[PDB]
Design a protein around this nucleic acid. Structure first.
Ligand SMILES: [Cl-]
Ligand SMILES: [Cl-]
Ligand SMILES: [Cl-]
Ligand SMILES: [K+]
Ligand SMILES: [Mg+2]
Ligand SMILES: [Mg+2]
Ligand SMILES: [Mg+2]
Ligand SMILES: [Mg+2]
Ligand SMILES: [Mg+2]
Ligand SMILES: [Mg+2]
Ligand SMILES: [Mg+2]
Ligand SMILES: [Mg+2]
Ligand SMILES: [Mg+2]
Ligand SMILES: [Mg+2]
Ligand SMILES: [Mg+2]
Ligand SMILES: [Mg+2]
Ligand SMILES: [Mg+2]
Ligand SMILES: [Mg+2]
Ligand SMILES: [Mg+2]
Ligand SMILES: [Mg+2]
Ligand SMILES: [Mg+2]
Ligand SMILES: [Mg+2]
Ligand SMILES: [Mg+2]
Ligand SMILES: [Mg+2]
Ligand SMILES: [Mg+2]
Ligand SMILES: [Mg+2]
Ligand SMILES: [Mg+2]
Ligand SMILES: [Mg+2]
Ligand SMILES: [Mg+2]
Ligand SMILES: [Mg+2]
Ligand SMILES: [Mg+2]
Ligand SMILES: [Mg+2]
Ligand SMILES: [Mg+2]
Ligand SMILES: [Mg+2]
Ligand SMILES: [Mg+2]
Ligand SMILES: [Mg+2]
Ligand SMILES: [Mg+2]
Ligand SMILES: [Mg+2]
Ligand SMILES: [Mg+2]
Ligand SMILES: [Mg+2]
Ligand SMILES: [Mg+2]
Ligand SMILES: [Mg+2]
Ligand SMILES: [Mg+2]
Ligand SMILES: [Mg+2]
Ligand SMILES: [Mg+2]
Ligand SMILES: [Mg+2]
Ligand SMILES: [Mg+2]
Ligand SMILES: [Mg+2]
Ligand SMILES: [Mg+2]
Ligand SMILES: [Mg+2]
Ligand SMILES: [Mg+2]
Ligand SMILES: [Mg+2]
Ligand code: NA
Ligand code: NA
Ligand code: NA
Ligand code: NA
Ligand code: NA
Ligand code: NA
Ligand code: NA
Ligand code: NA
Ligand code: NA
Ligand code: NA
Ligand code: NA
Ligand code: NA
Ligand code: NA
Ligand code: NA
Ligand code: NA
Ligand code: NA
Ligand code: NA
Ligand code: NA
Ligand code: NA
Ligand code: NA
Ligand code: NA
Ligand code: NA
Lengths: 73, 237, 56
RNA sequence: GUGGAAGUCUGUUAGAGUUGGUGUCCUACAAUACCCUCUCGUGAUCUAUGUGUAGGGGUGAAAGGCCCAUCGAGUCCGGCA
RNA sequence: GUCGGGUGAGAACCCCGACGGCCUAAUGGAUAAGGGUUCCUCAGCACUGCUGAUCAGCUGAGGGUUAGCCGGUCCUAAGUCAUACCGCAACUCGACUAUGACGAAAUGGGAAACGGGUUAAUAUUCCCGUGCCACUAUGCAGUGAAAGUUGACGCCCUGGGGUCGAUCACGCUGGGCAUCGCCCAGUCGAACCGUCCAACUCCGUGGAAGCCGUAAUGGCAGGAAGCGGACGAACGGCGGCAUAGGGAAACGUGAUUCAACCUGGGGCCCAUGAAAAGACGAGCAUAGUGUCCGUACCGAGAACCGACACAGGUGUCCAUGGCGGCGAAAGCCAAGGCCUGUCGGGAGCAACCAACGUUAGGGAAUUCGGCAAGUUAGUCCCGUACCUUCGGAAGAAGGGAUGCCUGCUCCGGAACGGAGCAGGUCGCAGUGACUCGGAAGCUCGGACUGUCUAGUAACAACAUAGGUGACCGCAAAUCCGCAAGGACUCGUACGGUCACUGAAUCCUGCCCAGUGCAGGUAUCUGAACACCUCGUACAAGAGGACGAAGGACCUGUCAACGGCGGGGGUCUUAAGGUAGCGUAGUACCUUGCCGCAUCAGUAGCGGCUUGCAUGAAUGGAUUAACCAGAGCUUCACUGUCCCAACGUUGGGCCCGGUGAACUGUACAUUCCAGUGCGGAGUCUGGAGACACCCAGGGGGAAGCGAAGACCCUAUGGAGCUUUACUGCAGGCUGUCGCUGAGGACUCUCACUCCGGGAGGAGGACACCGAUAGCCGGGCA
RNA sequence: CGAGUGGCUUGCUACCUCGAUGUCGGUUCCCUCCAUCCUGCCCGUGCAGAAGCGGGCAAGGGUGAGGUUGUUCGCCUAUUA
RNA sequence: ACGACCGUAUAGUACGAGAGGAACUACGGUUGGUGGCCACUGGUGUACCGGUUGUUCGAGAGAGCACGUGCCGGGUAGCCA
């Protein structure tokens, strides 16, 4: 998390860094199968180490609040 | 005095130019004779240097391979379709007319055939509101209501990479790197930190603009800095 | 770093060279243009009325 | 316990810089040098080679800095006795 | 450097031997650029060489660079050029679009060469031996042949394979030493041809419901381990090459750690890490061809740049030689190189100066200030405050240990790896040299890394993330161009332009009157064309009607420029200073008052505070970390001081050689007074004074150096500013032309844009040309 | 109130220098003046003594160390004839 | 080329109600200044001797280097305070 920032940058800057990157690094359930083997490949690029399914999602999360509103509509 | 920074830009010398040669693709919708039959497969998801968002590699039926402005949720193997009769799912492209009101779209053409102009950046999307035989009303990410020819093709879903703006750069070094993939001069020196000869706001024993910052629409280049034709400033009221 | 003596050391680049056209050592090999006769720029030879006094 | 992140630390590794000694020098070794001391040293890092931008114009993390010992407007010749 | 010796007319510095040193990422080895013959040989000394020279990078004359397989050449990169097109009064000018070409010698891609020999001087080029590539021809094979692979790629961590080297063990070969028995060197052998294959991937078998596996992550009924197999690597092993080569000789074997090279896994990106030619895909024999250009030497404290044989500057490879140690660190030492960072001789060698050692007692009393110097120091154990953004503070502080010798233990496969134990023992001192932090506290600033005045400023200044405001729907906002056109843009509001504030934390009040910006606007003002009246046989000209942008007028707007007082218990001019902070890096009075601290404190810190003249993104308060930033205190420390001494090295002084410059109206041995344009070696009066020379420290020559930077003067110059004067670009707006049909409207045909086209949008507007009004330090 | 001396302060003047007479403080080192702070000899005293106060001759010698401040000056401390 | 002070005797005396409290003169010392000298104390002493770390000469012996002594311990003469 943010601890690589030592005493630098401030509460708000690094707190948002830990927050974003904790969700960012959480176990993600792949769309294709159901397994939680989704990891971020790069900016906005996700994949599942299980079956290899590479997907297009959020920058730090594989799904965005707006990506979901799509499914419905 | 000397030309101010906004004037140096326009010359288009290396420093202000985008590293074009390093870019991947000019994302544009495909041109279809008609029929819609054009479909393809997502071969790969790559990173777009010019947009800092993901981009999908696609292989069309007639052999054409091209990168595409990718909607959130597209993956390898998926099938996309481009045409008047294209299915109505994420990743597909078809005129706003065939599209069902109330759906999130992206990469909307300003005029049919231009390949898409509006809503293309990270996580954005346009909103298709009204239909007609003459005008297709769309609400662009800025919030403005845009009247568009129903022939204008658009893509279903919201652009990929949402949430980018959410995480702070945290340190100069990060901006630095982002800024090296963009036609921009970075860092930026405040005008009040320059001399008289270099910028309308320069000079002075201390740092303060000389005149008021709101400037006229008619002010010529070299002098048009500060708050351009501001209808108001501050936050009060 | 001194702009004087110490900055003189890094000068091992070649620019002006013997000119194919005029024979003067003014053919800038990087610009491929001669600063003396204008070879590589003008078909006509570089020449100006200010190379001599006004009435001469 | 593992792991080995970082415009992270110490560091005359290489290399980059230039705080103090207001030392030495000051018809110099040198038209910006010497020595001791000191800063940085995985990064907005340093560097070679190639290449782009030209004079009221460039370039400038801005000191009116820099554009060949030349800069509040380079240099050459001309206007010019 | 010294002693000998050689040569020579002549020798400190040319050559030989010995002894003595210097260089260890360089003072060695190989090179890029740049130089251009400086390379080698012979003959020389008038020049050059910091002295000399028989020497030489000098002078003269001769000689020297050999390539199918090392570079270039070929390819493409940022980008450059040419031609076409278009612009321009025009071009040697100018952007776009097309086409073509250029664009990489260390250091991008890349068909193919190794070992040895040889010359005064070349060498993967010649010679000897062995091998390889491409193309073409003949012949056999082959119909396959272009999909695909390759070329071809970022940063960080890491495993495996593995050569050289180094080290360890033992043997052989040669050498050194001479109380021992040790110590040094060697022990070799290519390209290429053949062969072997770990890792990764995959197949069959198998059938795990908890096992498999790693340094770590991890894998699995969507099939784990195990077993069998396919594909598959090194500049690596093995065989050949090789009764080749090389060596005086032996011409070894094992092992560990393993640069090169090979091959895997993991992590990071608001950052995504070339392209093209070429190669493979796609066999073998035999033969022919393989042109052209580069190749000498230096590559630097004498061959490059810097006027010089300049203490400066200048890229790449050797990063594995030994001891040492954490180390590419210090110190010592090999190999290799050098005594050319090139003048010597003499004096116990004085004063004075440069670098430096040591100083008793005291211990910052020195000083603007502890400037300079000093103190501390490596490793391990113990232990560690306030504060804090919980990261940090922290190596806090403070305390203890530290060698050698003898015999051992533990981790590990092992190391010539690491951690411990017992006993013995010497010194003043065991990180024994070297290497190697002094510590603690208060206050200010800027949050942090970062940037800057090349050459007096490194800072509190710039930047920065973070906060905020403004403009814009893309035929946009913003910006360049005379134009043709262009940047932003392979971009699309989660964008990018234009500005302000400058991490976090708690906050950010009141004022729209002026100025600025923006919108509105009955009425007023408001130019030119066209129109109406007068005038003129026409024309000038006078007047009217209509009225755009702009302005008056109104509104919004301060994280827009800025402001937040006097008086009384409102007045100027809109409001009349809220949270804070406060004698401020802002406080005139001022050394403010009180306190702390000291023998004594214009300093510092705390409280107070009516603040000459604080205060909220002209950001306010505050704040951990950070800092060659500014002030202050304590412990420690010390030649900073009391107060100076002695010593070391290089000068200084004498001798040989070489050999400048600054400066000079003239005269000149001056001193004390006076006088003088009032600051005299020269005038006047007196005094003193024999001439020449050496050293010294600099009192005077208003000493030398620079036509004073300060000041004023000139109807001098330049940069900058603005509501100075006058103009100019540019923006907005009316009108005319392009321009067409039926004060409001429809259409389509020019014109513009979109679409590959068909066609779609827009449309007599827009663009462009002309003019008229407004704004107009952007510019002159 | 009146008369003066000095040339340390400050001001006035614009004579001297703008083809430059290097600034303030300090420091170091030298000579001087007396309008004398101490030291020697004196006079007076509201001089008992002691300690002073005022005055005269006298410049031989002395007149030191520190805390704040760039300070000159000055404030403060402890010694001191 | 000497300046000045302190201390003792004079004296708890003269003087003085008391408190307090001199002098002439003779002595001893200190301080600053001065000139000179090194028996003594102290400094230096890269003359010298020893201890010891690293490395090199194979060990030993005996030695070189570590900036003009590696460091540490001791130190004659001379020069000095
Ligand atoms: Cl950005
Ligand atoms: Cl070559
Ligand atoms: Cl692994
Ligand atoms: K003057
Ligand atoms: Mg595009
Ligand atoms: Mg932002
Ligand atoms: Mg970060
Ligand atoms: Mg850029
Ligand atoms: Mg800035
Ligand atoms: Mg400035
Ligand atoms: Mg200006
Ligand atoms: Mg400011
Ligand atoms: Mg400001
Ligand atoms: Mg210059
Ligand atoms: Mg760092
Ligand atoms: Mg460091
Ligand atoms: Mg460059
Ligand atoms: Mg300035
Ligand atoms: Mg020049
Ligand atoms: Mg020679
Ligand atoms: Mg010769
Ligand atoms: Mg080429
Ligand atoms: Mg190459
Ligand atoms: Mg040679
Ligand atoms: Mg050669
Ligand atoms: Mg030399
Ligand atoms: Mg002492
Ligand atoms: Mg003091
Ligand atoms: Mg210091
Ligand atoms: Mg074991
Ligand atoms: Mg030590
Ligand atoms: Mg800073
Ligand atoms: Mg400077
Ligand atoms: Mg600094
Ligand atoms: Mg500096
Ligand atoms: Mg700042
Ligand atoms: Mg911002
Ligand atoms: Mg900002
Ligand atoms: Mg105070
Ligand atoms: Mg202060
Ligand atoms: Mg405010
Ligand atoms: Mg006379
Ligand atoms: Mg003058
Ligand atoms: Mg002036
Ligand atoms: Mg002027
Ligand atoms: Mg077009
Ligand atoms: Mg002007
Ligand atoms: Mg003078
Ligand atoms: Mg008198
Ligand atoms: Mg006297
Ligand atoms: Mg003092
Ligand atoms: Mg020695
Ligand atoms: Na200003
Ligand atoms: Na952990
Ligand atoms: Na320095
Ligand atoms: Na100019
Ligand atoms: Na002229
Ligand atoms: Na010599
Ligand atoms: Na092999
Ligand atoms: Na080693
Ligand atoms: Na740093
Ligand atoms: Na206002
Ligand atoms: Na207003
Ligand atoms: Na204010
Ligand atoms: Na810094
Ligand atoms: Na000393
Ligand atoms: Na003199
Ligand atoms: Na100027
Ligand atoms: Na007088
Ligand atoms: Na006067
Ligand atoms: Na003069
Ligand atoms: Na002075
Ligand atoms: Na006297
Ligand atoms: Na004082």
């Amino acid at each position: 998390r943010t601890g690589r920032f030592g005493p630098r940058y401030g509460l708000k800057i690094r707190v948002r860094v830990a927050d974003v990157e904790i969700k960012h690094k959480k176990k993600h359930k792949c769309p294709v199968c159901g397994f939680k083997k989704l990891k971020r490949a790069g900016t906005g690029i996700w994949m599942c180490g299980h079956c290899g399914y590479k997907i297009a999602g959020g920058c730090y999360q594989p799904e965005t609040v707006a990506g979901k509103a799509v499914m419905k509509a | 005095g000397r030309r101010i920074q906004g004037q140096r830009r326009g010359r288009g010398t290396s420093t202000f130019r985008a590293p074009s040669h390093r870019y991947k693709a000019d994302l544009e919708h495909r041109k279809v004779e008609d029929g819609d039959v054009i479909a393809g497969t997502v071969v790969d998801i790559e990173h777009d240097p010019a947009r800092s968002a993901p981009v999908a590699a696609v292989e069309f039926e007639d052999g054409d391979r091209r990168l595409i402005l990718a909607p959130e949720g597209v993956g390898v193997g998926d099938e996309l379709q481009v045409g008047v009769d294209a299915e109505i799912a994420p990743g597909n492209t078809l005129p706003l007319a065939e599209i069902p009101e109330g759906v999130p779209v992206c990469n909307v053409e300003s005029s049919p055939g231009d390949g898409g102009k509006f809503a293309r950046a990270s996580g954005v999307n346009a909103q298709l509101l009204t239909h007609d035989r003459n005008v297709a009303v769309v609400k662009l990410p800025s919030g403005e209501m845009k009247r568009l020819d129903p022939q204008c093709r658009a893509t279903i879903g919201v652009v990929g990479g949402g949430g980018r703006t959410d995480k702070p750069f945290v340190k100069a070094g990060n901006k630095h790197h982002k800024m090296k993939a963009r036609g921009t001069k970075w860092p930026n020196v405040r005008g009040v930190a320059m001399n008289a000869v270099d910028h309308p706001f320069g000079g002075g024993g201390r740092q303060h603009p000389g005149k008021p910052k709101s400037i006229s629409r008619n002010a010529p280049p070299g002098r048009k800095v500060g708050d351009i034709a501001s209808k108001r400033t501050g936050r009060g009221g | 770093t001194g702009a004087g003596t110490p900055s003189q050391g890094k000068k091992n680049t070649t620019t002006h060279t013997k000119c194919r056209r005029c024979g003067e050592k003014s053919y800038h090999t990087k610009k491929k243009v001669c600063s003396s006769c204008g070879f590589g720029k003008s078909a006509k030879r570089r020449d100006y009325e200010w190379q001599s006094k006004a009435g001469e």
